[model samples]
Target: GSGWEVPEAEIHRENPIPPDARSLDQGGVLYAEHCVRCHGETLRGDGPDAHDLDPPVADLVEHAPHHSDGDLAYRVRIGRGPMPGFGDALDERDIWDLVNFMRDRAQGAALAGTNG
Candidate 1:
């Protein structure tokens, strides 16, 4: 139900928007604070923390193919990867904004439900 709640057609035509630019900037700061350590400031997965991991942090450049804003939002909110969940930490809008900020760097966007 959760996944089906929002149609993919709508998801494509309208990826959930993020907060204001300022909020996105702040979210960027937070992302840098916690994510940059391992995900790299550019999301390139070459961060200092990435080097020490057993599997190594995924290369953002390479991982973009697998990236998705929805999935990224889900990851940020729910948790996955070496990253922790922020479901209780940030609200939907904040999470949406974070997804937008990361989308470009990750080269992924929301998938369309019609063709999904």
Candidate 2:
């Protein structure tokens, strides 16, 4: 996967927002509003804005398994390049909700089909 070696501390960092159905559901709503335009409905990196980006939006379904949940959370907290950091816009709970949603999406995609 050519994954980067994040600091051990970062990978093992605690996730403050423990997920539940409600939080995940809320995350889905927010994701559609903010993320779908680039990450896509199925998170396949083929959204409307995907072509305009320098590096294509990440396919969360494909990439989620490569990192610990903590690492994924950290990346979202502090985004890079074309991906804007949501630290300022979202609270810790919201970020965690998004993480929860991504985790569920990854699992569902694996069970369904890659394009999911």
Candidate 3:
């Protein structure tokens, strides 16, 4: 097994989400609609548009080991790739819910307990 780690912050928003229900479902649903087009329908980065893009959408499962949930939340809210921010579109709970769903998808319940 490997341990998880996170580097210095590079984005503007901090992880403002909470491990709740509403946001998680929203995360799953919205990701399927907007993000899945490149990130894959199965969180595999092999989506329909995966081959047409430059750098891959990101192997979220593999990448999960590199950051905290809060960090991930922040990235989701203020993206660098085709991924965009939901800061203005979603509330804190929604952001956190997305993080939880993503973490759950990445590695079950382990990532969800990574916060202090």
Candidate 4:
């Protein structure tokens, strides 16, 4: 099941920023600072703090593609349960960059697993 209930407006919202190298670099830095402890370096939900949580962190490599970019962005913006929101800390561009990094990482992993 889809974990979060994103608003219709959020689900339809398109990402304005492109997943360029600079954007990914910024997002990577943000992820390390804010998300690494919980989401893990590999986005496997196996971060140092992952074991203590009630629901467990998500493995973005497996979970990210199932949702829309907008859905992912909304989750990051508002947060839920154990997750913290970055709406106040990060601006819209920062959020979009993070989303692009996540999508890129997940896609890269998928490609690596392909045989052809």
**Which candidate tops lDDT?**
4
Using all chains and alpha carbons, the TM-scores for the candidates as numbered come to 0.63, 0.80, 0.67, 0.89
lDDT of the candidates, in the order given: 0.62, 0.74, 0.66, 0.83
- What tens-digit string does per-residue lDDT give for candidate 4 at 11-114? 77878888988669999998888777788889897578777777767788877777678888988898855778897889888888888898899878877888
Report the C-alpha lDDT of model 1 over 1-116, residue by residue, as the tens digit: 23323334433443357445754686687777677888888777758888776555666644544656665566677665566677797787666766666665454333322355
Q: Considering lDDT, which of the candidate structures 2 and 4 is the better prediction for this target?
A: 4
* Candidate 4 structure, TM-score to reference: 0.89
Give model 2's TM-score versus the native structure.
Answer: 0.80
RMSD values, in order shown: 7.8, 3.7, 7.1, 2.2
Cα deviation at 48, candidate 1, in Å, is 1.8
Worst 10 residues of 3 by lDDT: 1-10
lDDT computed for candidate 3: 0.66
Comparing 1 with 3 on TM-score, the higher-scoring candidate is 3
**Candidate 4: misplaced stretches above 4 Å?**
1-3
Ranking by TM-score: 4, 2, 3, 1
- Lowest-scoring 10 consecutive residues by lDDT in candidate 4? 1-10
